Amino acid sequence: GSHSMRYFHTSVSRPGRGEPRFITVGYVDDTLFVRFDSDAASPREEPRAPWIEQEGPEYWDRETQICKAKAQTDRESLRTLLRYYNQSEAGSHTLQNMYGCDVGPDGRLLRGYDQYAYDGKDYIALNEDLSSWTAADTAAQITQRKWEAAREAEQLRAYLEGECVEWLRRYLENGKETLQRADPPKTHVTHHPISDHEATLRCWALGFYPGEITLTWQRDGEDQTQDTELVETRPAGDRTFQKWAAVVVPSGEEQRYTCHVQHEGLPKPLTLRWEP
Amino acid sequence: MIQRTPKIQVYSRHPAENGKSNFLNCYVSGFHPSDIEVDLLKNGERIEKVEHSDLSFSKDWSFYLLYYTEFTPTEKDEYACRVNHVTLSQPKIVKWDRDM
Amino acid sequence: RRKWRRWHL
């Protein structure tokens, strides 16, 4: 199917407690594959998936150089942003950046990204054209002017249409055992009385990969998404994910209700019911 | 600055079976700023040697982390996750409930 | 792999 590669970066200033902490992770789809933390002893980018371990010493060296350079750039950006927002040097602030690419089943570029948040709010983003920017405010407009003058988008475009796609293709082949395997959910339905006249039906999905899934409850065929409690999809810690969906129903009307499960790993979508 | 309080889920990697080794997870998500304190508790007591994932974030920029430890559940032992964050006036404790 | 170049804000 379709795939993505994303690099995530967070810098968090901590006045009086040294330089900002910098943490960056790389993903292919929902699989973590590299990490760098500036607070590690003598920090290096480290592998986190088996299929990247085969990259040579030169790969780790270049990646490590890039991570350290990005940390320094983000330190300068954080000092810049204090100026742009007229802020004191006393508080902790946060700079986030995600960049990467989406590709289709045929490996062709679907979309590229390069976007930033300051203190949890949109700051600047590369538009889908990979040629222009959206600035969230007058501060980000200053960055936009600078990056336009420097033709920074041209460099981003070349990377996103070239190396981003090409290296994603390489990782997908090298990791084809896992990255190109969808593990279906293991499912069941639990029943919990609330009161004399109501009960909770909970539909469970466990052990699935990737995280994309649809869990819905129907009453005699009618979607009940208005009344369905859907927890956030959560990591199991072994690459897989978990999720549940619950509906409160009238006692003795449980057989009206079906849970419907759609996932890439399933031979067919499931229709489940409470089985006494 | 806009702040977002964490969502908290406490759960096991595999379906709990008494006497069988497993992993206890506390997943904290949807929060900002990123500084957060997360402890796993056994019978009210802080578990030593808890590991966590590297800070990452979702499409809306909110942060998430997974804290986890190996454990062997029993019928008697109670587990919980204790979370503190600037948005909370006191730490929030969420109990592990295997029978959801 | 990561992009080599960038610029500060």
Q: Is A150 on the interface with C (CB under 8 A)?
A: yes
Tell me if the bond preceding B33 is cis, omega within 30° of 0.
Answer: yes
**Cβ contact A73–C5 (<8 Å):** no
- What is the count of residue pairs from A and B with beta carbons less than 8 Å apart? 72
**Cβ contact A70–C6 (<8 Å):** yes
CA distance A102 to A100: 7
Enclosing H/E stretch for A80: helix A57-84
Using CB atoms, which residue from A84, A150, A159 is nearest to C3?
Answer: A159
- What is the count of residue pairs from A and C with beta carbons less than 8 Å apart? 44
Residue A28: give the domain boundaries. Answer: 1-181
> Terminal CA-to-CA distance of chain A, rounded, Å?
38
Q: Are residues A54 and A150 in the same domain?
A: yes
The answer for residues whose C-beta is within 8 angstroms of residue C5's C-beta and 6 or more apart is A155, A159
Q: Are residues A42 and A101 in the same domain?
A: yes
Residue type, A200: T
Q: Are residues A123 and A237 in the same domain?
A: no
Residues of A in contact with C9 (CB under 8 A): 77, 80-81, 84, 95, 116, 123-124, 143
CA distance A124 to A135: 5
Match domain B1-100 to its CATH number in 3.10.20.30, 2.60.40.10, 2.40.50.100, 3.30.230.10: 2.60.40.10
Residues of C in contact with A163 (CB under 8 A): 1, 3
**Nominal resolution in Å?**
1.8
Q: Among A61, A155, A167, which would you mutate to test the C interface (most chain C Cβ atoms within 10 Å of its Cβ)?
A: A155
CA distance B25 to B12: 6
Cα dihedral across residues B28, B39, A204, B13: positive or negative: positive
Cα→Cα distances A32→A6, A143, A267, A271, Å: 10, 30, 26, 32
Q: Are residues A121 and A221 in the same domain?
A: no
Q: Are residues A159 and A270 in the same domain?
A: no
Domain boundaries, chain B: 1-100
Q: Is A231 on the interface with C (CB under 8 A)?
A: no
**Phi-psi region for residue A77, left (φ > 0), alpha (ψ -120 to 50) or beta?**
alpha
b (16+ CB within 10 A) / e for A52-81: beebeeeebeebeebbbebbebbbebbebb
Task: Report the gap between the CA of B44 and the closest CA in chain A (Å).
Answer: 23
Domain final residue pick, A142, A165, A181: A181
CA distance A122 to A179: 30
**Phi-psi region for residue A223, left (φ > 0), alpha (ψ -120 to 50) or beta?**
beta
Per the CB < 8 A criterion, the answer to whether A22 and A78 are in contact is: no
Residues of C in contact with A146 (CB under 8 A): 7
Q: Are residues A237 and A110 in the same domain?
A: no
Decide: B and C in contact? Rule: 3+ Cβ pairs under 8 Å.
no
CB count within 10 Å of CB A184 equals 17
- Give the CA dihedral B38, B44, B49, B52, nearest 10 degrees: -20
The answer for residues whose C-beta is within 8 angstroms of residue A26's C-beta and 6 or more apart is A5, A6, A7, A8, A32, A33, A34, A35, C2
Q: How many structural domains does chain A have?
A: 2
Residue A212 maps to which CATH number? Answer: 2.60.40.10
Q: Are residues A224 and A171 in the same domain?
A: no
Per the CB < 8 A criterion, the answer to whether B10 and B25 are in contact is: yes
Q: Are residues A161 and A46 in the same domain?
A: yes
Q: Are residues A264 and A165 in the same domain?
A: no
Q: How many CA atoms lie within 13 A of A202 on its CB side?
A: 15
**Cβ contact A81–C9 (<8 Å):** yes
CA distance B51 to B68: 5
CA distance A253 to B24: 35
- Residue A260, Cα to own-chain centre: how many angstroms? 25
CB count within 10 Å of CB A160 equals 23
Q: Are residues A219 and A119 in the same domain?
A: no
For residue C3, give the chain A residue with the closest CA.
Answer: A159
DSSP string for residues in A185-252:
PEEEEEEEEEETTEEEEEEEEEEEBSS--EEEEEETTEE-GGG-EEPPPEE-SSS-EEEEEEEEEETT
Residue A47 maps to which CATH number? Answer: 3.30.500.10
The answer for residues whose C-beta is within 8 angstroms of residue A56's C-beta and 6 or more apart is none
For residue A236, give the chain B residue with the closest CA.
Answer: B13
The answer for residues whose C-beta is within 8 angstroms of residue A101's C-beta and 6 or more apart is A4, A5, A109, A110, A111, A112, A113, A160, A164, A165, A168
Domain final residue pick, A181, A206, A234: A181
Domain final residue pick, A166, A181, A196: A181
Q: Are residues A62 and A167 in the same domain?
A: yes
Cα→Cα distances A233→A123, A189, B82, Å: 27, 17, 20
**Cβ contact A80–C8 (<8 Å):** yes
| Token reading at A254 | 């449980």
